[PDB]
Amino acid sequence: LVRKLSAQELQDLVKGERKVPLIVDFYATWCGPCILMAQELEMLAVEYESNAMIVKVDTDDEYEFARDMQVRGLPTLFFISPDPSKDAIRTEGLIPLQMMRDIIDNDM
Amino acid sequence: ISHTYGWPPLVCCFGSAQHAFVPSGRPANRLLDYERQERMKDAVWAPEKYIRAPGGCAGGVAIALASLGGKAAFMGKLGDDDFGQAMLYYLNVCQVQTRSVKIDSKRVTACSTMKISKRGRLKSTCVKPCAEDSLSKSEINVDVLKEAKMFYFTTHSLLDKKMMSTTLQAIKISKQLGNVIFYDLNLPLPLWQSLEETKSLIQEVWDLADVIEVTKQELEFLCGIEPTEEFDTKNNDSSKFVHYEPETVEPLWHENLKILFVTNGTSKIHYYTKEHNGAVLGMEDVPITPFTRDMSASGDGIVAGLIRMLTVQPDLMNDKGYLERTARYAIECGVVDQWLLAQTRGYPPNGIRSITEREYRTSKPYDEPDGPYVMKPVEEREYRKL
Amino acid sequence: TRTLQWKCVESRRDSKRLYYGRFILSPLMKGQADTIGIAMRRALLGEIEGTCITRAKFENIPHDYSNIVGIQESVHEILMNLNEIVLKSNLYGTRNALICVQGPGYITARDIILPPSVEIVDNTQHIATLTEPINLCIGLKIERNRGYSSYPIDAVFMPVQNANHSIHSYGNGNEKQEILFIEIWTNGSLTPKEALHEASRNLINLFIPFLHVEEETFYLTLPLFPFHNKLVNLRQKKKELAFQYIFIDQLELPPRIYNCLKKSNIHTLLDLLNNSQEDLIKMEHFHIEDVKKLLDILEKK
Amino acid sequence: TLQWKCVESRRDSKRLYYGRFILSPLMKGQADTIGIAMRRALLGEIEGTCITRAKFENIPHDYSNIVGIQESVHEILMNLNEIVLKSNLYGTRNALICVQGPGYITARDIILPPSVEIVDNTQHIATLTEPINLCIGLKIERNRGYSDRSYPIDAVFMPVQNANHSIHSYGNGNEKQEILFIEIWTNGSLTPKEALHEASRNLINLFIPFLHVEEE
């Protein structure tokens, strides 16, 4: 299940360690495309039952954290690797499901 | 080759071609008939809080302008990946000129490599920008700028320092070739904090713009006006739609500014010239779904309508009657574009699930055998005495 | 504030099921009032939906032409009384309602047990008269539809009883402006003002389909995605993309050549190929000296 | 879902465009209402551009014929009445014809205001025999169809030459379905597909005002 988290919960989740890639979905209640993105992400979560973790952060609540993550608009996804050396990937806009599968496999 | 230039004049839209991307969203008031809303509440979807987005990206404005019979070319960079090629295909089918689109085999469309810091508070500090942030000055299509009579751009192209220098170069070249500069603010999400940062960032491009379009919320933010009207109240009080006097917008004026447009959605559009100022009432009771609630289709439609009128009669940029006509035309374009987007996207019930408005307004039978609306057996009846 | 204004100049309540409204719209340019008037009239009389009882089920009745002991009216007379009951609802779908009463007394419309989406317009509408303490249970079905159509009930859904409009000259021939009046009669299921707004919305939804993209424009909610999935399928089983999806914008043609091809509505690579070498010369500003350089680009491609 | 498509297109000449369009599926009675409204919008609600006044300079002596010009003054006015134009002009502008001498004066020789364009460059105006200078000032206007020694020109503003609609009805049992066809003829100043779009937008703009609310 896609879980809603605050900025402190995500900090505790990023600083820690995991064996699966982490997807952070910055969203707001007022954005229509963010609702469409929610439908794609729950399909993706079902495909990768335990192979990945999908979390969402409300940018209206956490505008300071959204800004410090260099979120320039909505929808915005962060693909964070469990390998510390690897760098994360920021995607902007409504991207197709296949791109998320490619990001998770090829570079996450 | 000016003998080969046709009509209407070409418009160059400069920036990024994103897919359903919203820069920001601010609380807003729209004109509405609240007697109807109460009567139709069970059948017409409305947001709990009305929040309006200024618009979309430069690509969407080009698509909207091409739909109005205009001539639009998009200047930007896309990757050679499948998503970048799909977006290029979408622009070509929408009859946007993409000869000014640079295809980058080395960069990736809509994906940026960030270096997230795990020492203190989380920071991002982008490392490798996406394809639509890497347009270089050598890649600017000067031929498009020679033909184009208007140059359109938005603040999103000023966020990346490498991309900001390309935007400044394109603007300066366009001014040399006698192009009208249309600056659509569409303030991105980070800039809404630290007004001082916003002023420093946009100051240079602001003075080079002949036409500027801002939302009412953006105008208040740049002028240091704290919102004092109510939001989400069931009335159409004139304090929600106030036409600011020219003295209030004078500090933003500069020598070469021709027109300032202030938008409040399709509800009201204000215009300011050196000599004239005024406002036109509109209509914002359009069908809206959860998939279209940010009203970004209207903003692109409004700006496309303004561009269409300003480019076909460029000598009437100070005629008060034409400005009123231009503002009303923009309102109509925004209403139609918002109305169409609701039909295309539909309602919530690439796994994406949508239903039509006919299905959204279909109630349940209420035929439950335990329920009070069907014929029970003679045992449990309770025949209501007359 | 607005130059063109509309307003209700008279709104009258003749009875619970007879509403009257008159509206004015001015000033209009010559010919616009005629266009609005006929389109509004046709929408009011033919495009506004209503809701009413579509059928009734009786418990112990052989046929709809018999009599019930204790009821002054006959079964056929009951159906006629049900047919005249005016209902209002904004939602679609077959709803069901119930009449479950014990006499003696007067059965009216207020005795109907309605689902939460449906409402009665006139309480006093008469259904039956009970002259004996009997039990009467009648099941009902309710639909919202356009036009007109257990025992079926011949439903006439249209709520607008009549409409009228007039056009009057505004005055001196500055632009030959005109004044439009619209009169609307409804059955109380919606007010004349609401009928005027619904007809306007229905008319817009009838004309706006022409403003969607033409059929078969995009390759077949989000029209961008299906073409992307085609590219993923093409990447596997390396096939390359057909020339119909390749546009001349992606060829390195000189700007003068590009403008000529676009001026002739040649957009894709396949459109360019089907044109011969004599046809391109027929286009203005495109000459024989331009054929070799265009062919060489296509030779190199 | 309700969709439209162009089933036939043709360009007989520079001033004769034909187009046929389909809209389906429609519910009973809808196609007639759409077809009636669209036809009225196509014939008088679409703005066209025409020459409305002509003024012969150089003081041509106010006669019915001019020395050096084969055609009379009235024939020149009739020829100017037939010239097809398109534009986006707001208000009224002036054009000009200034021809040195012998040869054919055509629409190609008209000097046009900014947004005004000529559809058929070969349209004839006057034949000049003698090498006289002819200077004619023109008045150009953009108007809807339903709306000093300068000769008026009674122009008929109709970029859409003709329009018709027909309805086909299909059924399979109780399920009915109707299909709307719309035929459009234009004079080349506008394509039939463009005329279809402008008629729809003009109709929508006519009914938006009923949905307007007022400030309180």
Side-chain angles (χ1 to χ4, degrees), chain C residues 2 4 6 25 29-32 34-36 39-40 42 47 146 182 196-197 200-201 203-204 206-216, chain D residues 2-6 23 28-30 33-34 36-37 40 45 144 146 182 193 196-197 200-201 203-204 206-214:
Chain C
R2 310 177 183 267
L4 174 66
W6 77 269
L25 179 69
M29 308 304 106
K30 181 186 177 63
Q32 289 183 335
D34 318 65
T35 302
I36 298 174
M40 182 60 56
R42 288 191 147 263
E47 300 298 327
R146 57 187 282 113
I182 296 179
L196 183 65
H197 291 4
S200 300
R201 291 186 174 274
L203 283 168
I204 293 175
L206 285 176
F207 303 141
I208 214 173
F210 293 115
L211 302 187
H212 282 289
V213 301
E214 188 178 350
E215 186 178 23
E216 309 179 59
Chain D
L2 190 52
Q3 306 212 307
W4 76 274
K5 186 168 58 68
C6 178
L23 181 65
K28 181 79 177 306
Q30 287 185 325
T33 296
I34 299 175
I36 292 157
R40 175 152 182 85
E45 305 286 348
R144 299 186 310 113
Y146 289 143
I182 292 181
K193 186 183 284 82
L196 184 75
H197 291 135
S200 298
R201 285 188 181 267
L203 286 175
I204 292 170
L206 287 179
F207 297 106
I208 288 297
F210 284 115
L211 307 175
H212 285 168
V213 312
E214 304 280 21

Coordinates of all heavy atoms in Angstrom, one line a residue, chain C residues 2 4 6 25 29-32 34-36 39-40 42 47 146 182 196-197 200-201 203-204 206-216, chain D residues 2-6 23 28-30 33-34 36-37 40 45 144 146 182 193 196-197 200-201 203-204 206-214:
Chain C
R2 N -21.3 44.3 -17.7 CA -21.2 43.7 -19.0 C -22.0 44.5 -20.0 O -23.0 45.1 -19.7 CB -21.8 42.3 -18.9 CG -21.2 41.4 -17.8 CD -21.9 40.0 -17.8 NE -21.4 39.2 -16.7 CZ -20.4 38.3 -16.8 NH1 -19.8 38.2 -17.9 NH2 -20.1 37.6 -15.7
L4 N -23.4 43.1 -22.8 CA -24.6 42.2 -23.1 C -25.1 41.6 -21.8 O -24.3 40.9 -21.1 CB -24.2 41.1 -24.1 CG -25.2 40.1 -24.4 CD1 -26.4 40.7 -25.2 CD2 -24.6 38.9 -25.2
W6 N -28.4 39.8 -19.5 CA -29.7 39.0 -19.5 C -30.3 39.1 -18.1 O -29.6 39.3 -17.1 CB -29.5 37.6 -19.9 CG -28.9 36.7 -18.8 CD1 -27.6 36.5 -18.6 CD2 -29.6 36.0 -17.8 NE1 -27.4 35.6 -17.5 CE2 -28.6 35.3 -17.0 CE3 -30.9 35.9 -17.4 CZ2 -29.0 34.6 -15.9 CZ3 -31.3 35.1 -16.4 CH2 -30.3 34.4 -15.6
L25 N -32.6 39.6 -23.3 CA -31.2 39.5 -23.6 C -31.0 40.6 -24.6 O -31.5 40.6 -25.7 CB -30.8 38.2 -24.2 CG -29.3 38.0 -24.6 CD1 -28.4 38.0 -23.4 CD2 -29.1 36.7 -25.4
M29 N -26.5 41.8 -31.9 CA -26.3 42.2 -33.3 C -27.4 41.5 -34.2 O -27.9 40.5 -33.8 CB -24.9 41.8 -33.8 CG -23.7 42.2 -32.9 SD -23.7 44.0 -32.6 CE -24.3 44.1 -30.9
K30 N -27.6 42.1 -35.3 CA -28.7 41.7 -36.2 C -28.4 40.3 -36.7 O -27.3 39.9 -37.2 CB -28.8 42.6 -37.4 CG -29.9 42.2 -38.4 CD -29.9 43.1 -39.6 CE -31.0 42.7 -40.6 NZ -32.3 42.8 -40.1
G31 N -29.4 39.4 -36.5 CA -29.3 38.0 -36.9 C -29.0 37.1 -35.7 O -29.4 35.9 -35.8
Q32 N -28.3 37.6 -34.7 CA -28.0 36.7 -33.6 C -29.2 36.3 -32.8 O -29.3 35.2 -32.3 CB -27.0 37.5 -32.7 CG -25.6 37.6 -33.3 CD -24.6 38.3 -32.3 OE1 -25.0 39.0 -31.4 NE2 -23.3 38.0 -32.5
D34 N -32.2 35.7 -33.9 CA -32.9 34.6 -34.6 C -32.2 33.3 -34.4 O -32.8 32.3 -34.2 CB -33.0 35.0 -36.1 CG -33.4 36.4 -36.3 OD1 -32.6 37.3 -36.0 OD2 -34.5 36.6 -36.9
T35 N -30.8 33.3 -34.4 CA -30.1 32.1 -34.2 C -30.3 31.6 -32.8 O -30.5 30.4 -32.6 CB -28.6 32.4 -34.4 OG1 -28.4 32.9 -35.8 CG2 -27.8 31.1 -34.2
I36 N -30.2 32.5 -31.8 CA -30.4 32.1 -30.4 C -31.8 31.6 -30.2 O -32.1 30.6 -29.5 CB -30.0 33.2 -29.4 CG1 -28.6 33.6 -29.6 CG2 -30.3 32.8 -28.0 CD1 -28.1 34.8 -28.8
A39 N -32.6 28.0 -31.7 CA -31.8 27.0 -31.0 C -32.3 26.8 -29.6 O -32.4 25.7 -29.1 CB -30.3 27.3 -31.1
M40 N -32.5 27.9 -28.9 CA -33.0 27.8 -27.5 C -34.4 27.1 -27.5 O -34.7 26.3 -26.7 CB -33.1 29.2 -26.9 CG -33.6 29.2 -25.5 SD -32.5 28.3 -24.4 CE -31.0 29.1 -24.7
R42 N -35.7 24.9 -29.6 CA -35.6 23.5 -29.9 C -34.9 22.8 -28.7 O -35.3 21.6 -28.4 CB -34.7 23.3 -31.2 CG -35.5 23.7 -32.4 CD -34.8 23.2 -33.7 NE -35.7 22.9 -34.7 CZ -36.2 21.6 -35.0 NH1 -35.7 20.6 -34.3 NH2 -37.1 21.4 -35.9
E47 N -34.7 18.9 -25.7 CA -33.4 18.4 -25.2 C -33.3 18.4 -23.6 O -32.3 17.9 -23.1 CB -32.2 19.3 -25.7 CG -32.1 19.2 -27.2 CD -31.8 17.9 -27.8 OE1 -31.1 17.1 -27.1 OE2 -32.2 17.6 -28.9
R146 N -35.2 11.3 -21.8 CA -35.6 12.4 -22.8 C -36.8 11.9 -23.6 O -37.0 10.7 -23.8 CB -34.5 12.8 -23.7 CG -33.9 11.6 -24.5 CD -32.7 12.0 -25.3 NE -33.0 12.7 -26.5 CZ -32.6 14.0 -26.7 NH1 -32.0 14.7 -25.8 NH2 -33.0 14.6 -27.9
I182 N -37.4 35.8 -24.1 CA -37.7 34.4 -24.1 C -38.7 34.1 -23.0 O -38.5 34.5 -21.8 CB -36.4 33.5 -23.9 CG1 -35.5 33.7 -25.0 CG2 -36.8 32.1 -23.7 CD1 -34.2 33.0 -24.9
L196 N -33.8 27.5 -18.7 CA -33.0 28.4 -19.6 C -31.5 28.0 -19.5 O -30.8 28.0 -20.5 CB -33.2 29.8 -19.3 CG -32.5 30.8 -20.2 CD1 -33.1 30.7 -21.6 CD2 -32.7 32.3 -19.7
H197 N -31.0 27.8 -18.3 CA -29.6 27.4 -18.1 C -29.3 26.0 -18.6 O -28.2 25.8 -19.2 CB -29.2 27.6 -16.6 CG -29.2 29.0 -16.1 ND1 -29.6 30.1 -16.9 CD2 -28.8 29.6 -15.0 CE1 -29.5 31.2 -16.3 NE2 -29.0 30.9 -15.1
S200 N -29.1 26.0 -22.4 CA -27.8 26.6 -22.8 C -26.7 25.6 -22.7 O -25.9 25.5 -23.6 CB -27.6 27.9 -22.1 OG -28.6 28.8 -22.3
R201 N -26.6 24.9 -21.5 CA -25.6 23.9 -21.3 C -25.7 22.8 -22.3 O -24.7 22.2 -22.8 CB -25.6 23.4 -19.9 CG -25.1 24.5 -18.9 CD -25.0 23.9 -17.5 NE -24.4 24.8 -16.6 CZ -23.1 25.0 -16.4 NH1 -22.2 24.3 -17.1 NH2 -22.7 26.0 -15.6
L203 N -27.1 22.8 -25.3 CA -26.7 23.3 -26.6 C -25.2 23.3 -26.8 O -24.7 23.0 -27.8 CB -27.3 24.7 -26.9 CG -28.8 24.7 -27.2 CD1 -29.3 26.2 -27.1 CD2 -29.0 24.1 -28.6
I204 N -24.5 23.8 -25.7 CA -23.0 23.8 -25.8 C -22.4 22.4 -26.0 O -21.5 22.2 -26.8 CB -22.4 24.5 -24.6 CG1 -22.8 26.0 -24.6 CG2 -20.9 24.4 -24.5 CD1 -22.4 26.8 -23.3
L206 N -23.7 20.1 -27.5 CA -24.1 19.6 -28.8 C -23.2 20.2 -29.9 O -23.0 19.5 -30.9 CB -25.5 19.9 -29.1 CG -26.6 19.0 -28.5 CD1 -28.0 19.6 -28.9 CD2 -26.4 17.6 -28.9
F207 N -22.6 21.3 -29.6 CA -21.8 22.0 -30.6 C -20.3 21.8 -30.4 O -19.5 21.9 -31.3 CB -22.1 23.5 -30.6 CG -23.5 23.8 -30.9 CD1 -24.1 24.9 -30.2 CD2 -24.2 23.1 -31.8 CE1 -25.5 25.2 -30.5 CE2 -25.6 23.4 -32.1 CZ -26.2 24.4 -31.4
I208 N -19.9 21.6 -29.1 CA -18.5 21.4 -28.7 C -17.8 20.2 -29.3 O -16.6 20.1 -29.4 CB -18.3 21.5 -27.2 CG1 -17.0 22.1 -26.8 CG2 -18.4 20.1 -26.6 CD1 -16.8 22.4 -25.4
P209 N -18.5 19.1 -29.7 CA -17.8 17.9 -30.3 C -17.0 18.3 -31.5 O -16.0 17.7 -31.7 CB -18.9 16.9 -30.6 CG -19.9 17.2 -29.6 CD -19.9 18.7 -29.4
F210 N -17.5 19.3 -32.3 CA -16.7 19.7 -33.4 C -15.4 20.3 -33.1 O -14.5 20.5 -33.9 CB -17.5 20.7 -34.3 CG -18.7 20.1 -35.0 CD1 -20.0 20.5 -34.6 CD2 -18.5 19.1 -35.9 CE1 -21.1 19.9 -35.2 CE2 -19.6 18.6 -36.6 CZ -20.9 19.0 -36.2
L211 N -15.2 20.7 -31.8 CA -13.9 21.3 -31.3 C -13.0 20.3 -30.7 O -11.8 20.7 -30.4 CB -14.2 22.4 -30.3 CG -15.1 23.5 -30.9 CD1 -15.2 24.7 -29.9 CD2 -14.6 24.0 -32.2
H212 N -13.4 19.1 -30.6 CA -12.4 18.0 -30.3 C -11.6 17.7 -31.6 O -11.9 18.1 -32.7 CB -13.2 16.7 -29.9 CG -13.6 16.7 -28.5 ND1 -12.7 16.7 -27.4 CD2 -14.9 16.8 -27.9 CE1 -13.4 16.7 -26.3 NE2 -14.7 16.8 -26.6
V213 N -10.5 17.0 -31.4 CA -9.7 16.6 -32.5 C -10.5 15.6 -33.4 O -11.3 14.9 -32.9 CB -8.3 16.0 -32.1 CG1 -7.5 16.9 -31.2 CG2 -8.6 14.7 -31.3
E214 N -10.2 15.7 -34.7 CA -10.9 14.8 -35.6 C -10.7 13.4 -35.3 O -9.7 13.0 -34.7 CB -10.5 15.1 -37.0 CG -11.3 14.5 -38.1 CD -10.8 14.8 -39.5 OE1 -10.0 15.8 -39.6 OE2 -11.3 14.2 -40.5
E215 N -11.7 12.5 -35.7 CA -11.5 11.1 -35.4 C -10.3 10.6 -36.2 O -10.0 11.0 -37.3 CB -12.8 10.4 -35.9 CG -12.8 8.9 -35.6 CD -14.1 8.2 -36.1 OE1 -14.7 8.7 -37.0 OE2 -14.4 7.1 -35.5
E216 N -9.6 9.6 -35.5 CA -8.4 9.0 -36.0 C -7.2 10.0 -36.2 O -6.4 9.9 -37.1 CB -8.6 8.3 -37.4 CG -9.8 7.3 -37.3 CD -10.0 6.6 -38.7 OE1 -9.1 6.0 -39.2 OE2 -11.1 6.8 -39.3
Chain D
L2 N -19.1 10.3 -28.9 CA -19.4 11.2 -30.0 C -18.2 11.8 -30.7 O -17.3 12.4 -30.0 CB -20.3 12.3 -29.5 CG -21.0 13.3 -30.6 CD1 -21.7 12.4 -31.6 CD2 -21.9 14.2 -29.9
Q3 N -18.0 11.5 -32.0 CA -16.8 11.9 -32.7 C -17.2 12.5 -34.1 O -18.2 12.1 -34.6 CB -15.8 10.8 -32.9 CG -15.4 10.1 -31.6 CD -14.0 9.6 -31.6 OE1 -13.6 8.8 -32.5 NE2 -13.3 9.9 -30.6
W4 N -16.4 13.4 -34.6 CA -16.5 13.9 -35.9 C -15.4 13.6 -36.8 O -14.2 13.3 -36.4 CB -16.7 15.4 -35.9 CG -15.5 16.2 -35.7 CD1 -14.9 16.5 -34.5 CD2 -14.6 16.8 -36.7 NE1 -13.8 17.2 -34.7 CE2 -13.6 17.4 -36.0 CE3 -14.7 16.8 -38.1 CZ2 -12.6 18.1 -36.7 CZ3 -13.7 17.5 -38.7 CH2 -12.6 18.1 -38.0
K5 N -15.6 13.5 -38.1 CA -14.6 13.2 -39.1 C -15.0 13.8 -40.4 O -16.1 14.0 -40.7 CB -14.5 11.6 -39.2 CG -13.4 11.1 -40.1 CD -13.2 9.6 -40.0 CE -14.5 8.9 -40.3 NZ -14.8 8.9 -41.7
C6 N -13.9 14.1 -41.2 CA -14.1 14.6 -42.6 C -14.1 13.4 -43.5 O -13.1 12.7 -43.6 CB -13.0 15.6 -42.9 SG -13.1 16.2 -44.6
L23 N -20.9 13.4 -38.0 CA -20.9 13.4 -36.6 C -21.8 12.3 -36.1 O -23.0 12.3 -36.4 CB -21.4 14.8 -36.0 CG -21.5 14.9 -34.5 CD1 -20.1 14.9 -33.9 CD2 -22.2 16.2 -34.1
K28 N -31.9 10.4 -30.9 CA -33.0 10.8 -31.8 C -33.3 12.3 -31.6 O -33.5 12.8 -30.4 CB -34.2 10.0 -31.5 CG -35.4 10.3 -32.4 CD -35.3 9.7 -33.8 CE -36.5 9.9 -34.6 NZ -37.8 9.5 -33.9
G29 N -33.4 13.1 -32.7 CA -33.8 14.5 -32.6 C -32.6 15.4 -32.5 O -32.8 16.6 -32.6
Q30 N -31.4 14.9 -32.1 CA -30.3 15.8 -31.9 C -29.7 16.3 -33.2 O -29.3 17.5 -33.3 CB -29.2 15.1 -31.1 CG -29.6 15.0 -29.6 CD -28.5 14.4 -28.8 OE1 -27.7 13.5 -29.3 NE2 -28.4 14.8 -27.5
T33 N -31.4 19.4 -34.8 CA -31.2 20.7 -34.0 C -29.7 21.2 -34.3 O -29.5 22.4 -34.5 CB -31.4 20.5 -32.5 OG1 -32.8 20.2 -32.3 CG2 -31.0 21.7 -31.8
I34 N -28.8 20.3 -34.3 CA -27.4 20.7 -34.6 C -27.3 21.2 -36.1 O -26.7 22.2 -36.3 CB -26.4 19.5 -34.4 CG1 -26.5 19.1 -32.9 CG2 -25.0 19.9 -34.8 CD1 -25.7 17.8 -32.6
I36 N -29.6 22.4 -38.1 CA -30.2 23.7 -38.3 C -29.4 24.9 -37.7 O -29.2 25.9 -38.4 CB -31.6 23.7 -37.6 CG1 -32.5 22.8 -38.4 CG2 -32.2 25.1 -37.6 CD1 -33.7 22.2 -37.6
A37 N -28.9 24.7 -36.5 CA -28.1 25.7 -35.9 C -26.7 26.0 -36.6 O -26.3 27.1 -36.8 CB -27.8 25.4 -34.4
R40 N -27.3 27.9 -40.0 CA -27.5 29.3 -39.8 C -26.2 30.0 -39.4 O -26.0 31.1 -39.9 CB -28.6 29.5 -38.8 CG -28.8 31.0 -38.4 CD -30.2 31.3 -38.0 NE -30.4 32.7 -37.7 CZ -30.6 33.6 -38.7 NH1 -30.9 33.3 -39.9 NH2 -30.7 34.9 -38.3
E45 N -23.1 34.0 -39.6 CA -22.4 34.3 -38.4 C -20.9 34.3 -38.6 O -20.2 34.6 -37.6 CB -22.8 33.4 -37.3 CG -24.3 33.3 -37.0 CD -24.8 34.6 -36.3 OE1 -24.0 35.3 -35.8 OE2 -26.0 34.7 -36.2
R144 N -20.0 40.3 -40.5 CA -20.8 39.1 -40.5 C -21.8 39.1 -41.7 O -22.1 40.2 -42.2 CB -21.6 39.0 -39.2 CG -20.8 38.9 -38.0 CD -21.7 38.6 -36.7 NE -22.8 39.5 -36.7 CZ -24.1 39.2 -36.8 NH1 -24.4 37.9 -37.0 NH2 -25.0 40.1 -36.8
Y146 N -25.0 38.3 -41.6 CA -26.3 38.8 -41.2 C -26.3 40.2 -40.8 O -27.4 40.8 -40.7 CB -26.8 38.0 -40.0 CG -27.2 36.5 -40.3 CD1 -26.9 35.5 -39.4 CD2 -27.8 36.2 -41.5 CE1 -27.3 34.2 -39.7 CE2 -28.2 34.9 -41.8 CZ -27.9 33.9 -40.9 OH -28.3 32.6 -41.2
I182 N -22.8 17.0 -42.7 CA -22.8 18.4 -43.0 C -21.9 18.7 -44.2 O -20.7 18.3 -44.2 CB -22.3 19.2 -41.7 CG1 -23.3 19.2 -40.6 CG2 -22.0 20.7 -42.1 CD1 -22.9 20.0 -39.4
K193 N -13.2 22.8 -43.3 CA -13.0 22.4 -42.0 C -12.8 23.6 -41.0 O -13.3 23.5 -39.9 CB -11.7 21.5 -41.9 CG -11.5 20.9 -40.5 CD -10.2 20.1 -40.5 CE -10.3 18.7 -41.2 NZ -10.2 18.8 -42.6
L196 N -16.2 24.9 -40.3 CA -16.9 24.1 -39.3 C -16.5 24.5 -37.9 O -17.4 24.6 -37.0 CB -16.6 22.7 -39.6 CG -17.3 21.6 -38.7 CD1 -18.8 21.4 -39.1 CD2 -16.6 20.3 -38.8
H197 N -15.2 24.8 -37.7 CA -14.8 25.1 -36.4 C -15.3 26.5 -36.0 O -15.7 26.7 -34.8 CB -13.2 25.1 -36.3 CG -12.7 23.7 -36.4 ND1 -11.6 23.4 -37.3 CD2 -13.0 22.6 -35.8 CE1 -11.3 22.1 -37.1 NE2 -12.2 21.6 -36.3
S200 N -19.0 26.5 -35.0 CA -19.2 25.9 -33.7 C -18.8 26.9 -32.6 O -19.6 27.1 -31.6 CB -18.4 24.6 -33.5 OG -18.8 23.7 -34.5
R201 N -17.7 27.6 -32.7 CA -17.3 28.5 -31.7 C -18.2 29.7 -31.6 O -18.5 30.2 -30.5 CB -15.8 29.0 -31.9 CG -14.8 28.0 -31.6 CD -13.4 28.5 -31.7 NE -12.4 27.5 -31.4 CZ -11.9 27.3 -30.2 NH1 -12.2 28.1 -29.1 NH2 -11.0 26.3 -30.0
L203 N -21.4 29.7 -32.3 CA -22.6 29.2 -31.7 C -22.4 29.2 -30.2 O -23.3 29.6 -29.4 CB -23.0 27.9 -32.2 CG -23.6 27.8 -33.6 CD1 -23.9 26.4 -34.0 CD2 -24.9 28.6 -33.7
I204 N -21.3 28.6 -29.7 CA -21.0 28.5 -28.3 C -20.9 29.9 -27.7 O -21.4 30.1 -26.6 CB -19.7 27.7 -28.1 CG1 -19.9 26.3 -28.5 CG2 -19.3 27.8 -26.6 CD1 -18.7 25.4 -28.5
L206 N -22.5 32.4 -28.5 CA -23.9 33.0 -28.4 C -24.6 32.5 -27.2 O -25.5 33.2 -26.7 CB -24.7 32.6 -29.7 CG -24.3 33.4 -31.0 CD1 -25.2 32.9 -32.1 CD2 -24.4 34.9 -30.8
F207 N -24.3 31.4 -26.6 CA -25.0 30.8 -25.5 C -24.3 30.8 -24.2 O -25.0 30.6 -23.1 CB -25.4 29.3 -25.8 CG -26.3 29.2 -27.0 CD1 -25.9 28.7 -28.2 CD2 -27.7 29.6 -26.9 CE1 -26.7 28.6 -29.3 CE2 -28.5 29.5 -28.0 CZ -28.0 29.0 -29.2
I208 N -23.0 31.2 -24.2 CA -22.3 31.4 -23.0 C -22.9 32.5 -22.1 O -23.0 32.4 -20.9 CB -20.8 31.8 -23.3 CG1 -20.1 30.5 -23.7 CG2 -20.1 32.4 -22.1 CD1 -20.0 29.4 -22.6
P209 N -23.4 33.7 -22.7 CA -23.9 34.7 -21.9 C -25.1 34.3 -21.0 O -25.2 34.9 -19.9 CB -24.4 35.8 -22.9 CG -23.5 35.6 -24.1 CD -23.3 34.1 -24.1
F210 N -25.9 33.4 -21.4 CA -27.0 32.9 -20.5 C -26.4 32.3 -19.2 O -27.1 32.3 -18.2 CB -27.8 31.9 -21.2 CG -28.8 32.4 -22.2 CD1 -28.7 32.2 -23.6 CD2 -29.8 33.3 -21.8 CE1 -29.5 32.7 -24.5 CE2 -30.7 33.8 -22.7 CZ -30.6 33.5 -24.1
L211 N -25.2 31.8 -19.2 CA -24.5 31.3 -18.0 C -23.8 32.4 -17.2 O -23.1 32.0 -16.2 CB -23.6 30.2 -18.4 CG -24.2 29.1 -19.3 CD1 -23.2 28.1 -19.7 CD2 -25.3 28.4 -18.5
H212 N -23.8 33.6 -17.6 CA -23.1 34.7 -16.9 C -23.8 35.0 -15.6 O -25.0 35.0 -15.4 CB -23.1 35.9 -17.7 CG -22.1 35.9 -18.9 ND1 -22.0 36.8 -19.9 CD2 -21.1 35.0 -19.1 CE1 -21.1 36.5 -20.7 NE2 -20.5 35.4 -20.3
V213 N -23.0 35.3 -14.6 CA -23.5 35.8 -13.3 C -22.9 37.2 -13.1 O -22.0 37.7 -13.8 CB -23.1 34.9 -12.1 CG1 -23.4 33.4 -12.4 CG2 -21.6 35.0 -11.8
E214 N -23.5 37.9 -12.1 CA -23.1 39.3 -11.8 C -22.4 39.4 -10.4 O -22.6 38.6 -9.5 CB -24.4 40.1 -11.7 CG -25.2 40.1 -13.0 CD -24.7 40.9 -14.1 OE1 -23.5 41.3 -14.1 OE2 -25.5 41.3 -15.0

